[PDB]
Amino acid sequence: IQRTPKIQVYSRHPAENGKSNFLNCYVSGFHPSDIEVDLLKNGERIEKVEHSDLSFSKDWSFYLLYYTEFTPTEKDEYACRVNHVTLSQPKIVKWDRDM
């Protein structure tokens, strides 16, 4: 039995163009725990990405937060790319400052 991840991509602080911030990709609700997560800037993998220690919710499903410094702008696009045994191909969720 497997559970596919929920994915949210968002910033630590309210987004202001040109102001440094942190970009978060939160993956949750998944089982088993092996999961591949990349943060993307204009389609390319960001190298400086850290993550939380593996933990889980009361329903036993796992969650991780991946994060990195970023400075949002008008033109730059950010996204999170996730692969899991439940997914036949990597899922990409774009950063939208309204979500």
């Binding site: 949210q8 968002y10 630590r12 602080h13 942190f22 978060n24 939160y26 949750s28 937060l65 979500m99």
Partner: peptide, 12 residues
């Protein structure tokens, strides 16, 4: 949406 961590101890 599921409650999510900001990374500064707080949640959103």
């Amino acid at each position: 949406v599921e409650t999510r961590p900001a990374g500064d101890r707080t949640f959103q």
